[PDB]
Paper text:
Cytochrome P450 enzymes (CYPs) are heme-containing proteins that catalyze the insertion of oxygen into a wide variety of substrates. In the current study, we evaluated CYP153D17 (NCBI Reference Sequence, WP_010183267.1) from the endosymbiotic bacterium Sphingomonas sp. strain PAMC 26605. Sequence analysis revealed that CYP153D17 has 48.27% identity with P450pyr hydroxylase from Sphingopyxis macrogoltabida and that it contains conserved motifs including an oxygen-binding domain and heme-binding domains found in typical CYPs. In this study, we identified CYP153D17 from the endosymbiotic bacterium Sphingomonas sp. PAMC 26605 as a putative alkane-hydroxylating cytochrome P450 enzyme based on our substrate binding assay and structural data.
Residue numbers in the entry: 7 to 406
Write the structure that this text describes.
């Protein structure tokens, strides 16, 4: 079987073959049912306009029946079910989004701007020139995970624990990478235990920004307790680390493919902010999110039935030629670059978007300060998944 339009296949992303099928799907079937399968049947929502209309309709297309193409996958007593306010609806969703959003008030960005800058500086000065190395590990991960260590508190030493994402379950819960039942789950419990210790370490003092803090001593009018954790902090971890990483990893890789557009940026640091957006578009650190139809419905032609599983391929959206012409080129001056769907749309749009915008900016700032230019050597070891989207290894050196 090569459904071709079964764009679930982790092959396409690892090997970088997703461009053509999603080029056709847009031009002849932007809403298309993949009957079978790999994950079970889905609806490939593959274009810009249609996505928006799904995400602006939280009743017709729920977030509280799973949010990636993976499912609950079990009957009755094997418990599981890890809550997450990204996987919520109705009012409760707005309840809990309230209780983390103040971490990303632009004044908090200004407060954290100065620390972020020291660590971005400090990292880039450890780097040596023309000697090869791994952009992913030495920069994109190393920074990124620092940031998540400050958003919780670890503190510092052994913060590499936060690199237990292993949540590429867009391709891990599908006949088991690890048998699973006491593996990704046990990896997740050993996390939760550790964070429970951190929750009990903070039941004195005021709000110490986010780091549990914000879930309690900073009011938290609801957001009680009761293993929301494996869930909410699963969410927070992945959001606050992996997404940014693959972007930093993409600034090195991406720009280098389009070295003229890089040189213009190199010349003009006022381009930076639009550069950040343009890059976040390009990459789409999460290629897709899924909704689930609660009642029967019409959508761009197609006939969605209560039960059906939707699948919003931002990855293809951000290359919709209706909106961004020559989308498969990085163009750092591209005006509308800010209108990408990588952070998403509607009431779920990434609450951390301003922080990721900062982390990247400062990288490209601290880089300009230094006259860097990252030169990619081999091709990168990509991730194999429909959900996460970037790089496990990037081989580079730096010049001037
Ligand atoms: C380049 C960086 C990032 C990208 C591409 C990204 C992407 C996304 C996307 C696509 C969603 C779902 C959007 C939707 O349904 O409309 C989302 C939700 C979320 N992201 Fe991010 N994200 C990023 C950074 C962050 C950071 C830094 C944090 C936290 C510190 C974070 C926390 C979240 C949270 C909490 C949600 C769920 C919000 C809700 O309930 O609607 N993200 N993110
Ligand atoms: C079981 C696989 C789905 C869970 C993946 C973690 C939650 C995704 C949050 C996205 C970060 C913004």
């Amino acid at each position: 079987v090569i459904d071709r339009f079964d764009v679930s296949r982790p092959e396409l992303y690892r090997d970088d073959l997703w461009q053509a099928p999603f080029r056709e799907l847009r031009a002849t079937a932007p809403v298309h049912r993949v009957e079978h399968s790999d994950f079970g049947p889905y609806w490939s929502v593959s274009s810009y306009k249609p996505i928006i209309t799904v995400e602006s309709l939280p009743d017709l297309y729920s977030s509280a029946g799973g949010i990636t193409l993976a499912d609950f996958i079990e009957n009755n007593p094997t418990d599981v079910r890890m809550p997450m306010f990204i996987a919520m609806d109705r009012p409760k969703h707005t309840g809990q989004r309230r209780t983390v959003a103040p971490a990303f008030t632009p004044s908090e960005m200004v407060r954290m701007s100065d620390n972020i800058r020291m660590r971005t500086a400090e990292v880039l000065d450890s780097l040596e020139w023309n000697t090869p190395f791994d952009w992913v590990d030495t920069v994109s991960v190393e920074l990124t995970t620092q940031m998540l260590a400050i958003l919780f508190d670890f503190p510092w030493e052994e913060r590499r624990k936060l690199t237990f994402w292993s949540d590429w379950a867009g391709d891990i819960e599908l006949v088991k990478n690890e048998e699973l039942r006491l593996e990704r789950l046990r990896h997740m419990y050993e996390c939760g235990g550790y964070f429970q210790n951190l929750w009990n370490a903070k039941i004195g003092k005021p709000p110490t920004p986010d780091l549990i803090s914000m879930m309690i001593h900073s009011d938290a009018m609801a957001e009680m307790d009761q293993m929301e954790f494996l869930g909410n902090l699963i969410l927070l971890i992945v959001g606050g680390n992996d997404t940014t990483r693959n972007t930093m990893s993409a600034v090195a890789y991406g720009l280098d493919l389009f070295p003229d557009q890089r040189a213009k940026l190199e010349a003009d640091p006022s381009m930076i902010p639009n550069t950040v957006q343009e890059i976040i578009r390009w990459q789409t650190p999460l290629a897709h999110m899924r909704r689930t139809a609660t009642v029967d419905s019409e959508l761009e032609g197609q006939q969605i039935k209560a039960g059906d599983k939707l699948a919003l391929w931002y990855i293809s959206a951000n290359r919709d030629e209706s909106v961004f012409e020559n989308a498969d080129r990085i163009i750092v001056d591209r005006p509308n670059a800010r209108r990408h769907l990588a952070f998403g749309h509607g009431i779920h749009r990434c609450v951390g978007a301003r922080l990721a915008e900062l982390q990247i900016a400062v990288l490209l700032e601290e880089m300009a300060k230094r006259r860097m230019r990252v030169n990619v050597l081999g091709e990168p070891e990509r991730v194999a998944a429909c959900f996460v989207h970037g790089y496990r290894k990037l081989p580079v050196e730096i010049s001037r």
